[PDB]
Structures are given as structure tokens and as C-alpha cells.
Amino acid sequence: GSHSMRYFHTSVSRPGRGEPRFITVGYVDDTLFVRFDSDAASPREEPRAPWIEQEGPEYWDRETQICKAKAQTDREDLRTLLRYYNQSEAGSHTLQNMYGCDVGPDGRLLRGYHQNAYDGKDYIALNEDLSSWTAADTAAQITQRKWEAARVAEQLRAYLEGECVEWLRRYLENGKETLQRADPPKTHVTHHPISDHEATLRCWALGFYPAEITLTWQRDGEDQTQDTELVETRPAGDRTFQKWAAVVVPSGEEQRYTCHVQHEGLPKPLTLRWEP
């Protein structure tokens, strides 16, 4: 089906504790494959997936070179933002950036991205048209005007339409063993009496990949939208994910609840019931 590649960067100033820390990671779908941390002993972009290790020295030398310069630019940008916001040099601030592309089953560009956030809030973003910008405030408008005059959109567009999709396709072929394999969730339901009047029904989904998943409880076939505790999809640490959904049920009515699991790895959506 569809696939994506993303590069994530975040710089955090720490006044009086050296230069801003810079950390960037790369992903293809939900798989981390590259990383760079400025605080590392001898800072270099490192592989984090088997299928990227085959890349030669020129690849890594270039990536490393690129990450270091970005670290430098983020530093200059952090200073600029202090001005744009009339802020002190004494406080810590955060500059975040993400860019990447999405391609469909035909390996063709579906969507391209490039957005920035300052201290957790939206700052400036390249529009889906890959040629226009959206600034969140007047400070970000300063940037929009500089980028429109420098025609940054065109350079980004060129990359997103070309290299981005072409290297992604390359990574997809080289890591197809894992990147093009959906791991369906292994599921089951648990029962935990809470008192003589009620019990907890918990629907589990484990070892699944990718992360995208739908888990829902139904009471007499009606979605318990406003009565379902749903934890955030979490990583198992082995590359797969986990998740669960729970509902407090009146004891004796357990059989009126059904769990529904939807996942790219399942030929059909699953429906489970608590069966003692």
C-alpha cells in the first residue's frame, strides 16, 4: 500500500550548559533507520535498521556532513527566534522540524511535508501544494517573506518530488523483508472483577506492525465511544507495537460486549468475546 519517509529534528538550547543539543532520526513508515545525536562522543549518523547498513561510506559521510550543518543552522535559527519573539538569552527553547514524503502503491508521490515548530507550537509549514506557506503568527510571517524571496519552496518541492520518493523506493526494495511485511496483531480478551457489581474487559493487541490500528468495544453492537479506556499505541522495543482497550462492565452482562480489531495485517477485521 502506501509508504512514508520522515526525518525528524529537534534542537534545544541550554544556556550556560554549552551549545544547543541536536537530535535527528529517520523513519520509513514506523521503522527507525538512522540517528544522529550531537552529544555523542564522535557525532556521526548511525544506522538503526539492517537494510541501511549496505549503504557505502559516501552515503554516511554525506549524511553526517548534512546533520552537522543542520545542527549549525538550527543554532543560528534559535538565536533568530529569540529576536523575533523579543526573548531572553537566558532561557531554554526548542526548534523542531520534520520533512518527508508519502508514496502510494505505485511508488508515486502522494504527499510531501516540511513543517517547523518553536517551543512546541506550530511556526511555519509548507503547504500540500509544495509551493506556498502557512505562518502561524507575525514572527513566522517574517520567515515566510524571506523564504518566498529566496524561493525555498521550489527547492523543497524538487527534492520531495524527486530524491525523496526515489530513495524511499530504494529503501523499500532493500528492506522489503520487513518494510513490506505487515505483522497482524495477536489478540485476546482478559477479565478482571472490580467488585461484586462490575468487571473490566480488556482487549489486547500485541506484536503488530505497522502501528496504525483500530480497537473498539461494542455493547449490544453499539460503539462504546465515550466509555472506552484506550491506551496509546506503544512500542514493544522489538520493532512491533502494542495496545489495549477496556470497558467497565456490569457483572453478568459480559457476553453483550464485543471487541473489534482492524489492522492492515488482518485479512478481515476481528471480533472477540470474553470466553471462560
Binding site: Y7, I66, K70, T80, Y123, K146, L156, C164
Partner: peptide, 9 residues
């Protein structure tokens, strides 16, 4: 692979 062009805000 990452974009090469370096840009400042």
C-alpha cells in the same frame, strides 16, 4: 537520504 540545501528562518 536527507535534503542537502541548508536554509535559515
Amino acid at each position: 537520504r536527507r535534503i542537502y540545501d541548508l536554509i535559515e528562518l
